Motif scaffolding. Structure first.
Motif, short mmCIF file in Angstrom:
data_model
loop_
_atom_site.label_atom_id
_atom_site.label_comp_id
_atom_site.label_asym_id
_atom_site.label_seq_id
_atom_site.Cartn_x
_atom_site.Cartn_y
_atom_site.Cartn_z
N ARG A 90 0.74 -1.15 -0.06
CA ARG A 90 -0.03 -0.10 -0.10
C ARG A 90 0.75 1.21 0.00
N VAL A 91 0.54 2.35 -0.78
CA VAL A 91 1.15 3.43 -0.77
C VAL A 91 0.34 4.67 -0.27
N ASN A 92 0.86 5.44 0.53
CA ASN A 92 -0.14 6.47 1.37
C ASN A 92 0.17 7.79 0.66
N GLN A 93 -0.91 8.00 -0.01
CA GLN A 93 -0.97 9.44 -0.75
C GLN A 93 -0.58 10.53 -0.03
N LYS A 94 -0.95 10.64 1.05
CA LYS A 94 -0.53 11.76 2.14
C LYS A 94 1.02 11.87 2.52
N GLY A 95 1.81 10.98 2.47
CA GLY A 95 3.19 10.82 2.51
C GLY A 95 3.73 11.17 1.45
N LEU A 96 3.31 10.98 0.12
CA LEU A 96 3.79 11.46 -1.22
C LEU A 96 3.37 12.89 -1.05
N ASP A 97 2.31 13.37 -0.91
CA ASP A 97 1.88 14.85 -0.96
C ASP A 97 2.78 15.53 -0.05
N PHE A 98 3.17 15.47 1.29
CA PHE A 98 4.30 15.96 2.14
C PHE A 98 5.67 16.35 1.34
N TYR A 99 5.99 15.24 0.55
CA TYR A 99 7.29 15.49 -0.18
C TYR A 99 7.37 16.16 -1.45
N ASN A 100 6.16 16.20 -2.09
CA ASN A 100 5.99 16.79 -3.26
C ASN A 100 5.83 18.10 -3.05
N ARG A 101 5.15 18.79 -1.80
CA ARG A 101 5.19 20.02 -1.64
C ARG A 101 6.51 20.54 -1.25
N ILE A 102 7.18 19.80 -0.74
CA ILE A 102 8.77 20.16 -0.37
C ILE A 102 9.52 20.38 -1.45
N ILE A 103 9.33 19.53 -2.34
CA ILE A 103 10.33 19.36 -3.81
C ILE A 103 9.76 20.43 -4.82
N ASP A 104 8.51 21.06 -4.67
CA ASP A 104 7.77 22.04 -5.75
C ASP A 104 8.38 23.28 -5.24
N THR A 105 8.44 23.41 -3.75
CA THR A 105 8.90 24.74 -3.26
C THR A 105 10.35 25.00 -3.70
N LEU A 106 11.09 23.88 -3.59
CA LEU A 106 12.74 23.87 -3.47
C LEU A 106 12.70 24.27 -5.07
N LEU A 107 11.92 23.76 -6.08
CA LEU A 107 12.41 24.04 -7.49
C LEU A 107 11.82 25.44 -7.75
N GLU A 108 10.81 26.01 -7.15
CA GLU A 108 10.28 27.27 -7.32
C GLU A 108 11.45 28.30 -6.99
N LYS A 109 12.10 28.00 -5.84
CA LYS A 109 13.26 28.93 -5.41
C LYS A 109 14.70 28.52 -5.67
N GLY A 110 14.75 27.79 -6.74
CA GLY A 110 15.87 27.60 -7.53
C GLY A 110 16.89 26.63 -6.60
N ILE A 111 16.38 26.06 -5.64
CA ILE A 111 17.35 24.99 -4.77
C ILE A 111 17.24 23.54 -5.53
N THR A 112 18.24 22.82 -5.48
CA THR A 112 18.48 21.60 -6.10
C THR A 112 18.15 20.37 -5.06
N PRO A 113 17.21 19.65 -5.13
CA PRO A 113 16.90 18.56 -4.22
C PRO A 113 17.88 17.47 -4.43
N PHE A 114 18.65 17.01 -3.30
CA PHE A 114 19.32 15.75 -3.35
C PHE A 114 18.65 15.09 -2.36
N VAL A 115 17.82 13.89 -2.75
CA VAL A 115 16.94 12.96 -2.00
C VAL A 115 17.82 11.61 -1.47
N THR A 116 17.87 11.80 -0.09
CA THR A 116 18.46 10.50 0.45
C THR A 116 17.05 9.22 0.60
#
Ligand SMILES: OC[C@H]1NC[C@H](O)[C@@H](O)[C@@H]1O
Length: 443
Positions: A90-116
């Motif tokens: 099972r995949v938890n959509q709310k867990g994906l939402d939380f990282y999706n918001r962080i990822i989109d925000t970083l790209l908006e502000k021109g920060i490069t995400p490195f994901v562990t």
């Protein structure tokens, strides 16, 4: 002046369980660090990650700090049990939402995400099935990686499979100091092997799903020196091979464990471990090296591994770790010399000191500045001698939950007041901001 190459990536780093809090919010499964820290006696002062920095709610504000500081890259981790509460299925959509918001925000502000992908918070449900001790984790990890790649790989292009797998294996399953808190040398070397196979399976899925990205793996490293000119040199050779990147990079690049590791540990590895070695050789795009400390080492007939540490009169951090900046140069040069990876990053470097807020409302951590400056300098040196160092990441953005040390060790360049959750940028933070703007040192 010490100027770095154009495009060099200046970063800060965190990990999910250390900053987020809210470990059971929005349908998340328990992790092994939740159950480990909720067991009396395992963590200093009975601290847990229940609240931490409350990054689970304050994520936007923390990123704005990274933006305001001008930092170009953010290394963060994803909580496996937020995404798959039972570890697989099972995949938890709310867990994906939380990282999706962080990822989109970083790209908006021109920060490069490195994901562990994995920074120690294994789903508890998988630990019940043996966790890293179970060969099947290569499948579970592959399925988890695939989910991440499919959901985030359109935007995230720099990926790290495992954070410090030596720690995961040995400190988690031999020393018992970290989750899941076990003390069995045969389990600990099965974990080493399975970590490699899981890493290689994740890289394999990555080639299928993120055709324009880059993936690597991160290792802890110590600078080891011999106590005497004497078999003291050999005990240092053992520590480098066992505790540093060769334990994993000899398999990945050369198809076997390092010589001295086999002489010490062959009885503890699986019977036909060599059968997995060609799959383990899956090509990686970069090596991440973390570095903190140096150690003087001596052969000792009566120690667990024929090796003990001897204290030196050198400046130490609040961890009691000896400050040896030339270690970061040594380890960068040695990695080029032994395996010649196409790209290297310093994925973590930093220090803990007893920070306090002065009456003037500022945190005067000149000791952290001295630390960071000396190490950044040494990394500059390795670049000038041809090490393909493409980036450097300060551990950490925030003071946070320091594993079995709890909240008592502060690594951040931003202070966190845990009673209010107020953030206070430290002098070291302002200093690093200037380093990033200038793309290097100047004094
Ligand atoms: O101990 C300092 C720092 N080093 C290694 C780990 O990756 C990180 O989680 C930890 O907080």
């Amino acid at each position: 002046v010490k100027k770095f190459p154009e495009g060099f990536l200046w970063g800060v780093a965190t990990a999910s369980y250390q900053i987020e809090g809210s470990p059971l919010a929005d349908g998340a499964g328990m992790s092994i660090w939740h159950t480990f820290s909720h067991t009396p006696g395992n963590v200093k002062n009975g601290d847990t990650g229940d609240v931490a920095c409350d990054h689970y709610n304050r994520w936007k504000e923390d990123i704005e700090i990274i933006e305001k500081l001008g930092v170009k890259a953010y290394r963060f981790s994803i909580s496996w049990p937020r995404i798959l509460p039972e570890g697989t299925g099972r995949v938890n959509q709310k867990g994906l939402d939380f990282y999706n918001r962080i990822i989109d925000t970083l790209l908006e502000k021109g920060i490069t995400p490195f994901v562990t992908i994995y920074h120690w918070d294994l789903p508890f449900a998988l630990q019940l099935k043996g966790g890293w001790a179970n060969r099947e984790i290569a499948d579970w990890f592959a399925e988890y990686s695939r989910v991440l790649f499919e959901n985030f790989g359109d935007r995230v292009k720099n990926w790290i499979t495992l954070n410090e797998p030596w720690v995961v294996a040995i400190v988690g399953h031999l020393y018992g100091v970290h989750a899941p808190g076990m003390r069995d040398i045969y389990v600990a070397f099965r974990a080493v092997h399975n970590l490699l196979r899981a890493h290689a399976r994740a890289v394999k899925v990555f080639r299928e799903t993120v055709k324009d990205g880059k993936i690597g793996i991160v290792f802890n490293n110590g600078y080891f020196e011999p106590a005497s000119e004497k078999e003291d040199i050999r005990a240092v050779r053992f520590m480098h091979q066992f505790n540093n990147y060769p334990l994993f990079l000899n398999p990945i690049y050369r198809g076997d464990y390092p010589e001295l590791v086999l002489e010490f540990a062959r009885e503890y590895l699986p019977e036909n471990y060599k059968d997995d070695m060609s799959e383990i050789q899956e090509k990686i795009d970069f090596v991440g090296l973390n570095y903190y400390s140096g150690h003087l080492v001596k052969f000792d007939p009566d120690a667990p591994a024929k090796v003990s540490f001897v204290e030196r009169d050198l400046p130490k951090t609040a961890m009691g770790w000896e400050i040896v900046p030339e270690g970061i140069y040594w380890i960068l040069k040695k990695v080029k010399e032994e395996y010649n990876p196409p790209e290297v990053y310093i994925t973590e470097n930093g220090a803990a000191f007893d920070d306090v807020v002065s009456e003037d409302g500022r945190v005067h951590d000149q000791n952290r500045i001295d630390y960071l400056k000396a190490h950044i300098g040494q990394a500059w040196k390795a670049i000038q001698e041809g090490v393909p160092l493409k980036g450097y990441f300060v551990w950490s953005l925030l003071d946070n939950f320091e594993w079995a040390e709890g909240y008592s060790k502060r690594f951040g360049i931003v202070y966190v007041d845990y009673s209010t959750q107020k953030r206070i940028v430290k002098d070291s933070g302002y200093w690093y901001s200037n380093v990033v703007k200038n793309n290097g040192l100047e004094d």
